[PDB]
Design a protein around this ligand. Structure first.
Ligand SMILES: Nc1ncnc2c1ncn2[C@@H]1O[C@H](COP(=O)(O)OP(=O)(O)O)[C@@H](O)[C@H]1O
Ligand SMILES: [Mg+2]
Lengths: 77, 58, 526
């Protein structure tokens, strides 16, 4: 959604089309800012490592789980 | 069920405050994501100026 | 108030009623501050400092919470100190002791409201404490002759201790770190032999215990980066301008060539010392002080790895791990022992490089690498692993255990109630109150999980009254269960310390009848 908003695209329609295209087969669809729409992403040669996504998700989940454990704030010296 | 009355509301208030602060930070840095995101300029209290797109630096 | 003034300006005095009111308010406030962090489903506290440059931490430890707040009530300082010394003695039990003291004071206030002299309450509590400690002692189970039962008990103790802290997210994994590490000490209680290294990045489940040793140091330039079948000399000697010839001597000549000659002799002294060091037959040298760059090249030419600036702790830990001795004066190569290890190399963790020793000889000291996604997570993980190691070392020293989950408190309360039913007078009313305090620790635990505490405590009391001496709370479902089957096990020393310390602190506070304050030392504003 953010990627659709920053490029001046319509987020609701773009995300609905993304989900519809991912639910019926090919799993490499994405947002093309050059074309201004939705298309295969490997044809535009934009790729990234897997470690980036895996590490991001794991660290985010761990931080949220840590935050959910807190129920007080105390002012000290 | 029928009982277990919760007589303290401070934990819920603290949790909601934490949620609000985190969402505020996320919304603040949202605008810098993607090939069509712009930069931010920070002016330190000392007087130093930085123009950046990196999230950690911001 | 008498018309005549006996005191200075700013001095203060409070008498019986106000003194007791102030003391009880302070004690109860301190107890209720930390009630919330008790049991497997307690929560944590955020502490941030107004003065100390906005330092931030997230903690569950009772002693850590109490040592950081700025209490000014005199009756709270006693509880803070008692919690601190409890942490220093056994390392576990910090929250139960202060909660129990607060509950005892809360009962004592109503007892005083019923027109009973404090000394009567003190006598009743003394008898109740005697009976409770006897009943606890009779319930201990002492293993240690059989290896597998003892190791299973150690695993159960570690699991019970780690249940209330963050590490409970991976309770099994970290349990394997807590036991094995302690079993590396070979019966020595030196907890300084276990080094904990925490570094940012990665997940909490990526932590491990190394099979060798890790140093965060550097080797000199133009020396081998790895050695197989190493022989290690560990020394504590000066190598940067070693010639502190501690006399008050001086050089007084009439020519510059003489100064050059004496300079050359100074260099030859270092050369001779390095040759004497190399006479031992070593290929690895570790020193706690700095090594200047002339001995650096002397070692480099001989193909010997040299480590510099490895402070006292590192030297002692390496001595334990490898087996050498911390040598000096290097005149007798035969009388000094060298350490051995199968491989020394350099490993890369996160963004840093470390020296790794593998295949060590003894292994009587270890290192633990902690990984996490935030500084606060790492700090809390270390703070919890310390409690686990402390309780494990205490158990290894004295191996007799009891059952947790409210079993021990109910046993003590039942014994106290039976004693109270046999005695005449007002003291009985005191002893019953004692029991009502001990049955508050289980209740609070249930209150943190949302269970119907009253019904559970009634069932537990009924079960203990008829002889089921191993019944306790089953918190994964919230019922009554067998503690021996489920494996909830605690050490005897921790429970005994909790009971005795709480009783003595309550007795100390209850005897005060008048508080006197002197004029505070004014902070100089300007
Ligand atoms: N799995 C469990 N089931 C029931 N009770 C538990 C369990 N684990 C720990 N407890 C209880 O929780 C208490 C531990 O308190 P804790 O929150 O760890 O801080 P402290 O040990 O410093 O009081 C013990 O009295 C123990 O009986
Ligand atoms: Mg504990």
């Amino acid at each position: 959604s953010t990627l659709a908003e920053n490029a001046g695209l319509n987020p609701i329609s773009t995300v609905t089309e993304l989900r519809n295209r991912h639910a019926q087969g090919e799993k490499t669809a994405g947002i093309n800012v050059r074309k201004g729409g939705i298309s295969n992403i490997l044809e535009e040669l934009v790729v990234q490592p897997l470690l980036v996504s895996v590490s991001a998700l794991t660290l985010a989940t761990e931080t949220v789980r840590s935050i959910l454990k807190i129920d007080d704030v105390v002012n000290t010296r | 069920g029928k009982g277990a009355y919760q007589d303290r509301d401070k934990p819920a208030q603290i949790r909601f405050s934490n949620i609000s602060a985190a969402k505020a930070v996320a919304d603040a840095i949202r605008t810098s994501l993607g090939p069509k995101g712009m930069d931010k300029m920070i002016q330190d209290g000392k007087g130093d100026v930085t123009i950046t797109n990196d999230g950690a630096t911001i | 108030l008498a018309p005549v003034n006996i005191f200075k300006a700013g001095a203060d005095e409070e008498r019986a009623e106000t003194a007791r009111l102030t003391s009880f308010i302070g004690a109860i406030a301190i107890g209720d501050l930390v009630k919330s962090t008790l049991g497997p489903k307690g929560m944590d506290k955020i502490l941030l400092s107004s003065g100390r440059d906005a330092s931030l931490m997230v903690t569950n430890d009772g002693a850590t919470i109490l040592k950081n707040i700025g209490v000014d009530n005199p009756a709270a300082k006693v509880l803070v100190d008692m919690s601190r010394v409890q942490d220093d003695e056994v390392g576990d039990g910090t929250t139960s002791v202060t909660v129990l003291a607060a509950e005892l004071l809360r009962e004592a206030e109503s007892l005083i409201a019923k027109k009973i002299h404090p000394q009567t309450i003190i006598a009743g509590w003394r008898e109740a404490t005697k009976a409770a400690r006897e009943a606890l002692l009779s319930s201990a189970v002492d293993h240690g002759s059989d290896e597998v039962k003892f190791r299973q008990d150690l695993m159960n103790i570690a699991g019970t201790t780690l249940s209330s802290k963050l590490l409970t997210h991976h309770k099994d994994h970290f349990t394997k770190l807590a036991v094995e590490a302690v079993l590396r000490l070979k019966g020595s209680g030196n907890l300084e032999a276990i080094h904990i290294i925490k570094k940012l990045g990665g997940s909490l489940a990526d932590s491990y215990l190394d099979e060798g040793f890790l140093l965060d140091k550097k080797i000199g330039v133009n020396q081998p980066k790895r050695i197989e079948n190493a022989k290690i000399l560990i020394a504590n000697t000066g190598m940067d301008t070693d010639k502190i010839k501690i006399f008050g001597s001086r050089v007084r000549v009439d020519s510059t060539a003489k100064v050059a000659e004496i300079e050359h002799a100074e260099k030859e002294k270092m050369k001779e010392k390095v040759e004497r060091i190399l006479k031992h037959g070593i290929n690895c040298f570790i020193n706690r002080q700095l090594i200047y760059n002339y001995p650096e090249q002397l070692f480099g030419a001989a193909g010997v790895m040299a480590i510099e600036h490895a402070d006292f702790a590192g030297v002692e830990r390496l001595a334990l791990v490898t087996g050498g001795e911390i040598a000096s004066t290097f005149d007798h190569p035969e009388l000094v022992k060298l350490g051995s290890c199968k491989l020394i190399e350099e490993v890369m963790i996160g963004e840093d490089k470390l020296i790794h020793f593998s295949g060590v000889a003894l292994g009587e000291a270890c290192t633990i690498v902690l990984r996490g996604a935030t500084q606060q997570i790492l700090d809390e993980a270390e703070r919890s692993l310390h409690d686990a190691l402390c309780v494990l070392a205490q158990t290894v020293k004295d191996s007799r255990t009891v059952y947790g989950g409210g079993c021990s408190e109910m046993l003590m309360a039942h014994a106290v109630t039976q004693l109270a039913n046999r005695t005449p007078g007002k003291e009985a009313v005191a002893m019953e109150s004692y029991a009502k305090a001990l049955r508050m620790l289980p209740t609070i635990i249930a209150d943190n999980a949302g269970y119907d505490s009253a019904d559970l405590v009634a069932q537990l009391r009924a079960a203990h009254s008829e002889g089921n001496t191993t019944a306790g709370l089953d918190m994964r479902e919230g019922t009554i269960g067998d503690m021996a089957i489920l494996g909830i096990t605690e050490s005897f020393q921790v429970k005994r310390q909790v009971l005795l310390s709480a009783a003595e602190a309550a007795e100390v506070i209850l005897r005060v009848d008048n508080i006197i304050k002197a004029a505070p030392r004014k902070r100089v504003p300007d």
